[PDB]
UniProtKB/Swiss-Prot annotation:
The chain holds residues 229 to 559 of 933 of the full protein. It comes from Staphylococcus aureus (strain Newman). Belongs to the serine-aspartate repeat-containing protein (SDr) family. Changing A26S: Decrease in Fg-binding activity. This is Clumping factor A. Residues 319-331 have a biased composition (Acidic residues).
Length: 332
């Protein structure tokens, strides 16, 4: 179990991405590593990759998998994230019989909103031993949309091209206003050829209640101690084609704090369209006027380009036709 980090040779480390990264358009940076393994290495030896706290490796959730390093079709090393957030790779028995091994590794890295608190420049740094790479990038977060007492901010946190999935978060009432009888709907962005498939089989939804608006930062981060899972209290349905509906039904029939809706859905691999979505928050004000406010999220399901050029903005939809009723397709 010798830490041979300093014994690796021909080491290269790099950070690749555009000058601007868009976390809510499934944007991420690519961390790359290259190195030659000394022949003295044996099964059990390890090496450490220094990871900056500003990034979340391989995914936006804690369950993201650390990819193994390969040698031909054999696993060269298996990695794990330690208590410091760094990655520890442990060599397999491949090094016991193979000499002159040269390896590479690329891991997508997402912006960690807990450590990047608002739109601005951030200096990213990663490395192996004394071989480090640095890059300053501009991280962009859009302010939430607000129409009367209805505020909303939708996102697309990441997509998985091979498994045809995507993860989206919708921040309901980030402004902390008073909303009576609120309802959230998620549709395909209208008049577009969206590739999303929204239904009971393809869409998993969880809802969390935030203690207060003050607990939601400009990068939309909420400390785990300030939100709790209330999926049991809302009514989730899919009343129309490719549309989900979340009725909050709180005890007072009013919400005064933000709510986080996490959507894990799927894409139609045979669709030639992009992942285009429109989220709409409905609600009454004190004067019982039923209104609706939307937010559009769109990203190309190409994977080729990191991100950028997508869509992440507010949209005022045609207001509801009937009070208390949602629209099958929120246009305008
Ligand atoms: Mg060896
Ligand atoms: Mg982090
Ligand atoms: Mg706040």
């Amino acid at each position: 179990g010798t830490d041979i980090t300093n014994q690796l040779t021909n080491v290269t480390v790099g950070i690749d991405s555009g000058t601007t990264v868009y976390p809510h358009q499934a944007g991420y940076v690519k961390l790359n590593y290259g190195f030659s393994v000394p022949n003295s290495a044996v099964k059990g030896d390890t090496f450490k990759i220094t990871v900056p706290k500003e990034l979340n490796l391989n995914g936006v959730t804690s369950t993201a998998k650390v990819p193994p390093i390969m040698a031909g079709d054999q696993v060269l090393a298996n990695g794990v994230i330690d208590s410091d957030g760094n990655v520890i790779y442990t060599f397999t028995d491949y090094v016991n019989t193979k000499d002159d091994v040269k390896a590479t590794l690329t891991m997508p890295a997402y912006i960690d909103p807990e450590n990047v608190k608002k739109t601005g420049n951030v200096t990213l740094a990663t490395g192996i031993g004394s071989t480090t790479a640095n890059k300053t990038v501009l991280v962009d977060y859009e302010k939430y949309g607000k129409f009367y007492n209805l505020s909303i901010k939708g996102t697309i946190d990441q997509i998985d091209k091979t498994n045809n999935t995507y993860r989206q978060t919708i921040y309901v009432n980030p402004s902390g206003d008073n909303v009576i009888a609120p309802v959230l709907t998620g549709n395909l962005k209208p008049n577009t050829d969206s590739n999303a498939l929204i239904d009971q089989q393809n869409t998993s939804i969880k809802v969390y209640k935030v203690d207060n608006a003050a607990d939601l930062s400009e990068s939309y981060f909420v400390n785990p101690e300030n939100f709790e899972d209330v999926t049991n209290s809302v009514n989730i349905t899919f009343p129309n084609p490719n549309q989900y509906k979340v009725e909050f039904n709180t005890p007072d029939d009013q919400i005064t704090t933000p709510y986080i809706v996490v959507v894990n859905g799927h894409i139609d691999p045979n669709s030639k369209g992009d992942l285009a979505l429109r989220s709409t928050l409905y609600g009454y004000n004190s004067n019982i006027i039923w209104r609706s406010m939307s937010w559009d999220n769109e990203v190309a399901f190409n994977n080729g380009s990191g991100s950028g050029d997508g869509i992440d903005k507010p949209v005022v939809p045609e207001q509801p036709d009937e009070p208390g009723e949602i629209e099958p397709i929120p246009e305008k």
